[PDB]
């Protein structure tokens, strides 16, 4: 059993996450 | 049993994720 | 059993996502 | 068994997904 | 059991998806 | 059993998250 | 101008959407 | 100009939405 | 000018929305 | 300008939403 | 200009949200 | 201008938001 996780990143990234605003 | 992952980014990714607004 | 996964990416990507909005 | 998954992308990718805006 | 997938994009993809507003 | 974890980063990362502002 | 808009619902409803598994 | 929006649900609704799964 | 807007909601209501799993 | 919005809600509701599990 | 806005809630609402997961 | 808003809840109220677990 042999396992190779590779991940590479060269681009920027912008995130943007609102979670709520819910009236109750 | 031989396994390989690979994950290549080079571009900018912009995300925006709204979850919510909802009236109960 | 040999096994590969390749992913590769060089165009920018802009999604938004909307979840909500709902009135009950 | 010999498996290979290769994906490409080169082109920009606009995504808009809206789910919502239900009245109950 | 040779088994292979290759998936290739080189033009701009643009996607709406809206799913809702439904009244109940 | 041998287990391989690769990540590395090169482009500039902005993330804003917001959770709340809900009315109850 | 008198408008009236009236909707009632008395029946269990199941919905069931699948927007993708497209490959480029 | 008099405008009325009434809105009444009594049955159980169960909604399963899917988007994604796309490969490019 | 007289505007009403009713939402009367007695039904349980159960909803799962997936977006993503797309591979670029 | 008379304006009025009610929204009653007497019904168990529950909402599972999931984004992500993107690979670029 | 005379605006109200009125909200009720009497059921038990559960709510899950996952953002992310995703792999660059 | 006369404004009014009003919140009343009753009712138990469970969330889980999880925003995170990107591998960069």
Do not use: E, K
């Amino acid at each position: 059993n042999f396992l190779v996780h590779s991940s590479n990143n060269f681009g920027a990234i912008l995130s943007s996450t609102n979670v709520g605003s819910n009236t109750y």
